């Protein structure tokens with residue numbers, strides 16, 4: 001991954 | 008806020 005969120 | 012990221 002490497003991005004974040006939260007969805 | 009309350010959401011995340013990262014931008």
Ligand SMILES: *[C@@H]1O[C@H](CO)[C@@H](O)[C@H](O)[C@H]1O
Nearest residue numbers: 003004005006011012013
């Ligand atoms: C999500 O990423 C942030 C940034 O590194 C960190 O501070 C949180 O503990 C992690 O859940």
Ligand SMILES: *[C@@H]1O[C@H](CO)[C@@H](O)[C@H](O)[C@H]1O
Nearest residue numbers: 004008009010011012013
């Ligand atoms: C989200 O990320 C910030 C930055 O590291 C941190 O301060 C919060 O505790 C984490 O939930």
Ligand SMILES: *[C@H]1C[C@](C)(N)C(O)(O)[C@H](C)O1
Nearest residue numbers: 005006007008009010011
């Ligand atoms: C991350 C934060 C958020 C977008 N407010 C959420 O609580 O809805 C999600 C489930 O986790």
Ligand SMILES: *[C@H]1C[C@](C)(N)C(O)(O)[C@H](C)O1
Nearest residue numbers: 001002003004012013014
């Ligand atoms: C959160 C993750 C990311 C989008 N890959 C970033 O490193 O570019 C940003 C600065 O922090």
